[PDB]
Design an enzyme around this catalytic site. Structure first.
Site, PDB file in Angstrom:
ATOM      1  N   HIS A 164     -14.813 -16.983  14.830  1.00  0.00           N
ATOM      2  CA  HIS A 164     -15.947 -17.894  14.587  1.00  0.00           C
ATOM      3  C   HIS A 164     -15.596 -19.396  14.609  1.00  0.00           C
ATOM      4  CE1 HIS A 164     -15.141 -18.018  10.100  1.00  0.00           C
ATOM      5  NE2 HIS A 164     -15.408 -19.293  10.365  1.00  0.00           N
ATOM      6  N   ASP A 220     -14.125 -10.745  13.544  1.00  0.00           N
ATOM      7  CA  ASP A 220     -13.820 -12.161  13.323  1.00  0.00           C
ATOM      8  C   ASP A 220     -12.315 -12.458  13.288  1.00  0.00           C
ATOM      9  OD1 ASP A 220     -14.313 -14.878  13.092  1.00  0.00           O
ATOM     10  OD2 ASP A 220     -15.023 -14.785  10.997  1.00  0.00           O
ATOM     11  N   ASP A 245     -13.027 -18.173  -5.276  1.00  0.00           N
ATOM     12  CA  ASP A 245     -13.311 -17.679  -3.927  1.00  0.00           C
ATOM     13  C   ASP A 245     -12.660 -18.597  -2.911  1.00  0.00           C
ATOM     14  OD1 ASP A 245     -14.562 -16.230  -1.816  1.00  0.00           O
ATOM     15  OD2 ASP A 245     -16.614 -17.008  -2.266  1.00  0.00           O
ATOM     16  N   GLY A 250     -14.121 -24.099   5.600  1.00  0.00           N
ATOM     17  CA  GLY A 250     -12.934 -24.868   5.954  1.00  0.00           C
ATOM     18  C   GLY A 250     -11.644 -24.093   5.735  1.00  0.00           C
ATOM     19  N   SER A 281     -11.663 -20.798   6.481  1.00  0.00           N
ATOM     20  CA  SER A 281     -11.803 -19.806   7.549  1.00  0.00           C
ATOM     21  C   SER A 281     -10.606 -19.809   8.473  1.00  0.00           C
ATOM     22  CB  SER A 281     -13.054 -20.081   8.370  1.00  0.00           C
ATOM     23  OG  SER A 281     -14.216 -19.769   7.631  1.00  0.00           O
ATOM     24  N   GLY A 282     -10.163 -18.617   8.850  1.00  0.00           N
ATOM     25  CA  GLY A 282      -9.016 -18.468   9.745  1.00  0.00           C
ATOM     26  C   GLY A 282      -7.694 -18.333   9.012  1.00  0.00           C
TER      27      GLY A 282
END
Ligand SMILES: COc1ccc(-c2ccc(C(=O)N[C@H](CO)C(C)(C)C)cc2C(=O)O)c(C(=O)Nc2ccc(C(=N)N)cc2)n1
Ligand SMILES: COc1ccc(-c2ccc(C(=O)N[C@H](CO)C(C)(C)C)cc2C(=O)O)c(C(=O)Nc2ccc(C(=N)N)cc2)n1
Ligand SMILES: [Ca+2]
Lengths: 254, 55
Positions: free
Chosen positions: A41, A90, A186, A190, A192-193
């Protein structure tokens, strides 16, 4: 990262920072000198592939200490099953233009074998998630790399313990839930990945990728991560392949 | 054997025909004579934190 702590410099040496025209895009995980695992994504809105940079050995975004290593991204490999603008499959496999040099600050995370990841790593309760993402839902991002310890849930329990939203993505067999439903901790936008790293008998392994979640640390919700164990064989086969021109490569999955 | 307690392996486990089991190690590691433990063979093996390893 919401409710975590600063990762002491050199303690997250597999962490990658992905930049587009120098701006923060996503995180990633170094798995060897040439290869980085990120989230598919992250690349949905990329126009010019030549402006994509991976940074290893980074700690504090406001300063350079000489431990950083920047590389151009020669290839962005995404499964054929991934659909831009959606959550399933993803994962992205990135080939760096030149290898990084392994140092005290730059070390790959182990990509485990599928069986070991499914039979053993999937049952280790806590794992570390990291990134320079938002420190709060609707907040500013971190300047120093943050890290958070999160418990993993079985999908059945995640669905039972989660609040119903409507138009909410389905949690597939290519995902897993991890985190807390009490609004405290959590991973966030930013991040992500970035890695969801699991410790087993003195060694750390790649088990998840920061993928999605309802807001950040939303009461009644958990973070959702790509289940890396489903992609081991797909990743290993591609790491043995020859590069192709045109950065983006859609590769058949399975 | 591999299904329970990782067949006693520190890292990777392979079941064989009969009561046979082989433990294995990731690249940058080698299997010790105990047939279960993995020790680094390189300076920067994957999944280890040099600053914490160097104490
Ligand atoms: C780290 O360095 C910088 C540098 C500049 C900015 C920034 C701040 C304000 C603005 C902005 O829109 N400013 C207007 C006036 O032009 C205000 C009305 C907010 C004052 C734009 C930017 C930008 O990235 O281009 C930012 C910054 O926070 N940018 C940013 C960009 C996109 C998102 C998103 N996708 N929701 C979130 C944040 N960061
Ligand atoms: C699944 O597909 C997408 C597509 C895009 C995004 C996304 C959208 C905007 C932004 C964003 O505002 N980015 C700005 C710059 O434009 C930052 C300054 C935060 C990097 C970030 C992301 C991201 O990839 O993390 C996201 C997205 O927001 N991902 C995400 C990841 C984890 C959680 C959680 N564990 N609570 C929540 C959300 N997901
Ligand atoms: Ca380069």
């Amino acid at each position: 990262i919401v409710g975590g702590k600063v990762c002491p410099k050199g303690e997250c040496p597999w962490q990658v920072l992905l930049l587009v025209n120098g701006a923060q895009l996503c995180g990633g995980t170094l798995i060897n000198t040439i290869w980085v695992v990120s989230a598919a994504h992250c690349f949905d809105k990329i126009k010019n592939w030549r402006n994509l940079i991976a940074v290893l050995g980074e700690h504090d975004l406001s300063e350079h200490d000489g431990d950083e290593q920047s590389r151009r991204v020669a290839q962005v490999i995404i499964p054929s099953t991934y659909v831009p603008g959606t959550t399933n499959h993803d994962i992205a496999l990135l080939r760096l233009h030149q290898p990084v040099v392994l140092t005290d600050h730059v070390v790959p995370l182990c990509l485990p074998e599928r069986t070991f990841s499914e039979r053993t790593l999937a049952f280790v309760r806590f794992s570390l998630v990291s990134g320079w993402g938002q420190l709060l839902d609707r907040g500013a991002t971190a300047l120093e790399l943050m890290v958070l310890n999160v418990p993993r849930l079985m999908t059945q329990d995640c669905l039972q313990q989660s609040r119903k939203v409507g138009d909410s993505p389905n949690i597939t067999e290519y995902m897993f839930c991890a985190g807390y439903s009490d609004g405290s901790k959590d991973s966030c936008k930013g991040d992500s990945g970035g890695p969801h790293a699991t410790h087993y008998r003195g060694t750390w392994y790649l088990t998840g990728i920061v993928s999605w979640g309802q807001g950040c640390a939303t009461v009644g919700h958990f973070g959702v991560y790509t289940r890396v164990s489903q992609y081991i064989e797909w990743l290993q086969k591609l790491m043995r392949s020859e590069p192709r021109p045109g950065v983006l490569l859609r590769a058949p999955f399975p | 054997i591999c299904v329970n307690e990782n067949g006693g392996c520190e890292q990777y486990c392979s079941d064989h025909t009969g009561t046979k089991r082989s433990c294995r190690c990731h690249e940058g590691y080698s299997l010790l004579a105990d047939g279960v433990s993995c020790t680094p063979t390189v300076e920067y093996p994957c999944g280890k934190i040099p600053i914490l390893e160097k104490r």
